[PDB]
Each structure stands twice: as structure tokens, then as C-alpha cells.
Symmetry: C2
Subunit: 27 residues, 2 copies
């Protein structure tokens, strides 16, 4: 796994709303 200080950040991007979430959208 990756090194210290690192922190994976998986955000959902709704290019429609070109907005971001930290979740898999409900839709």
C-alpha cells in the first residue's frame, strides 16, 4: 500500500452536474 501522508480519495463526478461526491450516487 501507499506511503505516509497519503490518503486515497475516491469521489464520484457527475459531469452532468460536473459536481463531486464522496459517494456512489443514488441517482
Amino acid at each position: 500500500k501507499l506511503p505516509p501522508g497519503w490518503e486515497k480519495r475516491c469521489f464520484y463526478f457527475n459531469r452532468i452536474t460536473g459536481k463531486r461526491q464522496f459517494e456512489r450516487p443514488s441517482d
Copy 2:
């Protein structure tokens, strides 16, 4: 699957180097 316009994205942040990647660094 994801709703329209959505795409699950993920960038790693090494707060050490407070920089970002789209990967879990080699380490």
C-alpha cells in the same frame, strides 16, 4: 451501474507532499 454523467474517480493525496495522484503510490 452509476447514474448519468457519473463516473467514480479517485485521487491519492500525499499530505506530506500535499500533492495528488490518480493512483495508490508505489510507496
